[PDB]
Chain A
Amino acid sequence: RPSRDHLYLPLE
């Protein structure tokens, strides 16, 4: 149940 600042996309 993450806060929005904990959504991370590991882009390359």
Chain B
Amino acid sequence: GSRSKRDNNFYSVEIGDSTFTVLKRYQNLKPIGSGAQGIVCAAYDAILERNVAIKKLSRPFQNQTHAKRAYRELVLMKCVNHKNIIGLLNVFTPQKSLEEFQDVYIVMELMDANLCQVIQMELDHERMSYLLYQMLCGIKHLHSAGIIHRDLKPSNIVVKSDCTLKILDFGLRYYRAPEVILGMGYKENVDIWSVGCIMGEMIKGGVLFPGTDHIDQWNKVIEQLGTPCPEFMKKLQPTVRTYVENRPKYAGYSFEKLFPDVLFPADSEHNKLKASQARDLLSKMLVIDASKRISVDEALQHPYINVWYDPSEAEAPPPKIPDKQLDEREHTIEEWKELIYKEVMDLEH
């Protein structure tokens, strides 16, 4: 064809049951992870002379919700530049026309692992608090851009062996806040719940609230933390409220019982203090009613976290988001495909 000459910019490699077709600069692809949206490889970028990560997203325009999330991810990864948010190095599609376009490849800095194996390590307070600080800095930065995540979880947070941390994406069941799973309103501190779930899991090993489904998720939460107040119940839609109220009246456990000293270090007065501080922060993050839950700014000032505080990191000015791109405007699926294709072709280096 007329555009067929473009194909020579790329080559293909089989990765499991998928073909990766990438720019020739990216060499020796190897799988490093998988999620729902994409398959991720490590590669050597011969132009930058460094290793990178490459995520393949197929058919990001499959419906309006998927398309909005994908477009927002491209826009935000481009305009955001913060040490605790994964950076965009390149984006491309190997297909040569709008009609043939299906796959988007996002090239990022290569981190070493996701937070999953860290959670199972024996972490001291120094490493736990620094990881949590970094997560809070990244979340604060997103919130300052008008971006509330709602879906933070260990698989979308990555680390390096120097204990640095970056969040992989920009959001929208074990880690989702009550207000998300129950379809209520939400505000910024929706993301504090998820931080609390991850912190709690670092200490307890097991997922705190391992619901087998939606209602089971709620049951795990109230069994541990107690049935919420009538003030909370009145904020529920009528059908949801009937469910939520139609079960046993759990009182919950104290945070001393949920997170006893035996799960923390006890070799010193310093560590005794830090166990108490960690438990105190957990008691302020793992709060069902968001109106009584700590904010991100308050968490960053909490003594457990604040030892790491640096305003150049926590108060970095927000990105300039380009006009309308992060709108609430709606579009047909064909229009969404066109918008994403245009963004991909514009963004490529």
Give the B-binding residues of A (Cβ under 8 A).
2, 4-5, 7-12
A residues near B161, Cβ cutoff 8 Å: 8-11
Give the A-binding residues of B (Cβ under 8 A).
112-113, 117-118, 121, 126-127, 130, 159-163, 308
A7: nearest residue on chain B (CB-CB)? B163
Would you call A5 and B162 a contact (CB within 8 A)? yes
Min C-beta distance of A2 to chain B, whole Å? 6
Of the A-B pairs whose beta carbons lie under 8 Å apart in the complex, a sample of 7, sorted by A's number, is A7-B127, A9-B118, A9-B127, A9-B159, A9-B163, A11-B117, A11-B118
Would you call B117 and A8 a contact (CB within 8 A)? no
Min C-beta distance of B335 to chain A, whole Å? 43
A7 and B126 alpha carbons, distance in the complex (Å): 8
Would you call A2 and B126 a contact (CB within 8 A)? yes
Would you call B162 and A12 a contact (CB within 8 A)? no
Would you call B163 and A12 a contact (CB within 8 A)? no
Min C-beta distance of B311 to chain A, whole Å? 16
A2: nearest residue on chain B (CB-CB)? B126
Would you call A11 and B159 a contact (CB within 8 A)? yes
Would you call A8 and B126 a contact (CB within 8 A)? no
A5: nearest residue on chain B (CB-CB)? B162
Min C-beta distance of B152 to chain A, whole Å? 19
Would you call B130 and A7 a contact (CB within 8 A)? yes
Of the candidates B112, B118, B163, the one having the most CB atoms from chain A within 10 angstroms of its own CB is B163
A4 and B256 alpha carbons, distance in the complex (Å): 30
B residues near A9, Cβ cutoff 8 Å: 112-113, 118, 121, 127, 159-163
Would you call A7 and B112 a contact (CB within 8 A)? no
A6 and B127 alpha carbons, distance in the complex (Å): 10
B residues near A10, Cβ cutoff 8 Å: 121, 161
Given A5-B162, A7-B162, A7-B163, are A12 and B117 neighbors across the interface (CB < 8 Å)? yes
B residues near A4, Cβ cutoff 8 Å: 130, 163, 308
A9 and B161 alpha carbons, distance in the complex (Å): 5
Nearest first, the 3 A-B pairs at minimum CB distance are A7-B163, A11-B113, A11-B112
A residues near B159, Cβ cutoff 8 Å: 9, 11
B118: nearest residue on chain A (CB-CB)? A9
B residues near A12, Cβ cutoff 8 Å: 117
Min C-beta distance of B117 to chain A, whole Å? 7
A5 and B112 alpha carbons, distance in the complex (Å): 16
B residues near A5, Cβ cutoff 8 Å: 162
Min C-beta distance of A5 to chain B, whole Å? 7
A1 and B160 alpha carbons, distance in the complex (Å): 20
A12: nearest residue on chain B (CB-CB)? B117
B residues near A11, Cβ cutoff 8 Å: 112-113, 117-118, 159, 161
A2 and B116 alpha carbons, distance in the complex (Å): 24
A residues near B113, Cβ cutoff 8 Å: 9, 11
Min C-beta distance of B165 to chain A, whole Å? 10
Min C-beta distance of A7 to chain B, whole Å? 4
A5 and B126 alpha carbons, distance in the complex (Å): 12
B163: nearest residue on chain A (CB-CB)? A7
Min C-beta distance of A3 to chain B, whole Å? 10
A3 and B126 alpha carbons, distance in the complex (Å): 10
Would you call A8 and B112 a contact (CB within 8 A)? no
B residues near A7, Cβ cutoff 8 Å: 126-127, 130, 162-163
A residues near B162, Cβ cutoff 8 Å: 5, 7-9
